Structure 1
Amino acid sequence: KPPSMYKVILVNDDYTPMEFVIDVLQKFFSYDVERATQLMLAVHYQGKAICGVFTAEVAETKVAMVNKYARENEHPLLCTLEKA
């Protein structure tokens, strides 16, 4: 019984700075700046994008950490889980 996998999703909003999202992507998903920036733009232009796909526990930890980091820096940036 292989484990269910979960997609980590970033949702676009109009107030979180692009610089910040890029930072999030490097810090919590090990993206280099270039890939991070493109990914931020995929979110920005499409409204949402998949940052990664992980085992449930890993995914839920990423999500919780990304959101906490966002609120602590007073941004509304929303990270969510989706079952793959």
Structure 2
Amino acid sequence: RDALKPPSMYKVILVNDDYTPMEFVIDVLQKFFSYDVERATQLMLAVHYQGKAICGVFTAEVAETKVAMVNKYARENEHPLLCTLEKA
């Protein structure tokens, strides 16, 4: 059913928490979004100070893989770090 034409795009959001180490979030940003350290740190800080930030905007499938991978990587490392998606 439905239609055609452009795909819907999705924002990948990182949410702030009080317990995930900053160093860890930086690592996530390099590892899963190809940020260098400089940009990664600034983005971590945007999250830290603003409570949430957009890490990237992607097609639905790419976005979901990022989110799934980010959250799995956080839990496996015993951090509550939450990554979520938003339709752009």
TM-score bracket, normalised by the shorter chain, equals: over 0.9
CA shift, 1:33, in A, is 0.1
Shift in Å, 1:78: 0.1
The yes-or-no answer on 1:64 pairing with 2:82 is no
Name structure 2 gaps, 5 residues minimum: none
Give the C-alpha shift of residue 80 in structure 1: 0.1
Q: What displacement does 1:46 show?
A: 0.1
User: Normalising by structure 1, what TM-score?
Assistant: 1.00
Q: Distance in 1 between matches of 2:75 and 2:84?
A: 14
Runs ≥4 residues deviating over 6 A: none
Q: 3-state DSSP class of the match of 1:20?
A: helix
Shift of 1:76: 0.1
SS at match of 1:50: strand
- The count of corresponding residues between Structure 1 and Structure 2 is 84
1:15-68 per-position Cα deviation (integer Å, ceiling 9, x unaligned):
000000000000000000000000000000000000000000000000000000
Match of 1:14 among 18, 24, 30: 18
Q: What are the ranges of 5 or more consecutive residues in structure 1 without an aligned counterpart? A: none
Deviation at 1:9, TM superposition (A): 0.1
Seq. identity, %: 100
Give the Cα separation in 1 of the matches to 2:34 and 2:85: 18
Alignment of 1:28-47 (within 5 A): 28-47=32-51
Q: Looking at CA atoms only, which structure, 1 or 2, has the larger radius of gyration?
A: 2
Give the whole-Å Cα distance in 1 for the aligned partners of 2:40 and 2:75.
20
TM-score (ref. length: structure 2): 0.95
Instruction: Work out the CA distance in 1 between the residues paired with 2:76 and 2:21.
Output: 14
Alignment of 1:48-63 (within 5 A): 48-63=52-67
